[PDB]
């Protein structure tokens, strides 16, 4: 209950308290015959009569209502952090329960000490939190949480995001050429700023569209990171079953020794540790059946030859069935070039919007939204198959290229040129990385020659 009235970052304090309780149970069991700690824990978690427990339910509640809409990812450190000027304050979490000190860590001093110890985990989310989450949710909770996140992304993409996409597609220019190098960098910046004026001045853009995109990106990032943590716990679980399953390591054969005979000697050294044959020889039919089933469960883990992220990406691709995303067939029969009827051009416009320097009294996009915004945008682009067209056709990349060529620097409508190209380069690096990862995880129309009259 104390977990249920706190944010997601308190999962570490939760498992610490659970470990204290387990140690208490172990100590008291030396003299008293209590219920197994698993039985007590399941009874307290409402996980006996029901599939999922309170901890996983609150984990999903926290995700939905506080984690996706309030945290900012950092790619290099691999950590989330709360946003500045938070978008959601409607959580209304349960009121904290209180009790005597011996139901918490054990005393006033111990309570203070442990609170100080775990206060260090409060202002970020990172690998340790994911370890605890996986370890407490198991396959059941992980699967249910991923399914619910898929439902959330489906609702968001086919809901508010779709409406804003339609509106902005209406507002975008009908035709937009990429000017030639001879036009200049200042001229090209002025041209882009004039053409995208309606998108630049759209008030609700940065406060609604970017918020929902950040939510989607945070969801997919959570799926990726939680899968990585699950694999990392599975490998450790397997490293401990090896002795009882006969998985010897490779031994060092010195001069004049046979690897096969050496390994046979090692195997016969450890043969007493091998569990299944020992029970088969000395055990009972029911014991043998249970041992076989348990060994089969133990040795087969997702870390060895299975993956989950690609299935999530395919399911998400199945949600973009509206015709607005892909647009109508190209006139020339190959691909749109100067038209703006595809999502990747809308994203290029949004990139132009958030690559402009801002005033000191305002907040930058990475201060408010982090890296989830770009993960969402690049995911949408990649799933539709528009990544290469996006790379070739893009206002910001074109401006960066031309400015690099001619090396100019001025101010256009209160937008310094050199600073803008530097920001564009940084975001280009980030976008290339994201696109490359997404392509990695996902692993012909011929034409007729002319006919003589």
């Amino acid at each position: 209950g104390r977990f249920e009235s706190e944010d997601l970052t308190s999962i570490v304090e939760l498992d610490g308290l659970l470990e204290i309780n387990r140690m208490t149970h172990k100590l008291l069991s030396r003299y008293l015959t209590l219920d197994g700690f698993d039985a007590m824990f399941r009874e307290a978690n409402h996980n006996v009569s029901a599939p999922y427990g309170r901890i996983t339910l609150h984990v999903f509640w926290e995700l939905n209502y506080d984690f996706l809409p309030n945290y900012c990812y950092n790619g290099s450190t691999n950590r989330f952090v709360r946003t500045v000027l938070p978008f959601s304050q409607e959580f209304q979490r349960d009121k904290q329960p209180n009790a005597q000190p011996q139901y918490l860590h054990g005393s006033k001093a111990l309570n203070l000490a442990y609170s100080s110890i775990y206060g260090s985990y409060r202002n970020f989310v990172g690998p340790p939190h994911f370890q605890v989450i996986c370890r407490l949710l198991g396959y059941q909770g992980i699967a249910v949480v991923m399914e619910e996140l898929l439902k959330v992304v489906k609702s968001l993409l086919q809901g508010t995001i779709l409406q804003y996409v339609k509106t902005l597609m209406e507002v975008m220019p009908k035709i937009c050429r990429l000017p030639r190098h001879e036009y200049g960098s200042p001229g090209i910046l002025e041209f882009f700023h004039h053409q995208l004026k309606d998108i630049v001045e759209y008030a609700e853009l940065k406060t609604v569209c970017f918020q929902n995109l950040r939510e989607v990106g945070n969801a997919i990032l959570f799926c990726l990171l939680i899968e990585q943590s699950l694999s990392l716990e599975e490998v450790c679980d397997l490293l401990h079953a090896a002795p009882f399953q006969n998985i010897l390591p490779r031994v060092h054969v010195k001069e004049g020794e046979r690897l096969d005979a050496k390994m046979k000697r090692l195997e016969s050294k450890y043969a007493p540790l091998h569990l299944v044959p020992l029970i088969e020889r000395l055990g009972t039919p029911q014991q043998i059946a249970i041992a076989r089933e348990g060994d089969l469960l133990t040795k087969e883990r997702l870390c060895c030859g299975l993956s989950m992220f690609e299935v999530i990406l395919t399911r998400i691709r199945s949600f973009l069935d509206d015709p607005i995303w892909r647009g109508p067939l190209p006139s020339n029969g190959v691909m749109h070039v100067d038209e703006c009827v595809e999502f990747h051009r809308l994203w290029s416009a949004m990139q132009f919007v958030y690559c402009i320097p801002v005033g000191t009294h305002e907040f930058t996009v990475e201060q408010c939204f982090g890296d989830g915004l770009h993960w969402a945008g690049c995911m949408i682009i990649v799933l539709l198959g528009q990544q290469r067209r996006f790379a070739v056709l893009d206002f910001c990349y074109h401006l960066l290229k031309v400015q690099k060529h001619d090396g100019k620097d001025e101010i256009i409508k209160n937008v310094p040129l050199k600073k803008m190209v530097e920001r564009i380069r940084k975001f280009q690096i980030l976008n290339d990385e994201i696109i490359t990862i997404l392509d990695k995880y996902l692993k012909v129309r011929c034409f007729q020659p002319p006919i003589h009259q």
Partner: peptide, 8 residues
């Protein structure tokens, strides 16, 4: 989602 209704 509907599990949100259930938890509510």
């Amino acid at each position: 989602s509907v599990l949100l209704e259930a938890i509510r």
